[PDB]
């Protein structure tokens, strides 16, 4: 249960920084995702819209 999922529209390069225990600018001031996080990350093209 408790299968919570997100939605963000974010800058291309910064994508990789969204992983457990990783630094940067989003990882500090815009988002934290828990350390030892076992969940799943899915991304794709939205320049088209």
């Amino acid at each position, epitope marked *: 249960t408790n299968v919570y999922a997100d939605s963000f529209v974010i800058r291309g390069d910064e994508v990789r920084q969204i992983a457990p225990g990783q630094t940067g600018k989003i990882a500090d001031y815009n988002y934290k995702l828990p350390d030892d996080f076992t969940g799943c990350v899915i991304a*794709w093209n939205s320049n088209n819209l």
Partner: antibody
Amino acid sequence: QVQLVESGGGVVQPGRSLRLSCAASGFTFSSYGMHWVRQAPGKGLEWVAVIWYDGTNTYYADSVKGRFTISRDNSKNTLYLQMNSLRAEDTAVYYCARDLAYRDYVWRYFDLWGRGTLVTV
Amino acid sequence: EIVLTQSPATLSLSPGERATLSCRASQSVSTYLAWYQQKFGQAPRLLIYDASNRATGIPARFSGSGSGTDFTLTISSLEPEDFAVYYCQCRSNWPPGITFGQGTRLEI
């Protein structure tokens, strides 16, 4: 020395079976997913099989659905592949290949290629 | 299913000039197309992935562009290292697979 070398090339009658191998070397085997893509003589590339880096999932192309078995043994860091019910079209240069991505599931690109083994029937 | 349609059937041109091939996909693929360059007998090597991204080991004289069902590759300066055949490639959901094109030969 980041290379794959295939193994098991030979000739067999129609209806019979063959088992091939790819040896991997120069990198950590159990961290990438592996493909085999086969290049029929005089023709283009046709993907045959894949395996995830953790060996939990495989997909096979339509031409080989249910007929080949893809498997990795990390003990020797050697990939294998069994074959069943080979037919005349199966003649090819099986290039064992390595997936491009480290720990991504998308499985689109082949970054590094075995020299390719002839197999004909 | 996507069947790639390649034009012109062949190119004949002098070295040093600008060579532009076109690959018109049947239906939109977003941004997900690759180019493969195969010399006679050789092993093809990826050139472009994501349909404008210059993959590693590729001098900047190789450029490609396009999305949806328009995709074209340009070469600034042809040299005998570059005179080969070329395919346009993608991936699929229904039925999962890959469809290549027919191939496009280059001549002096």
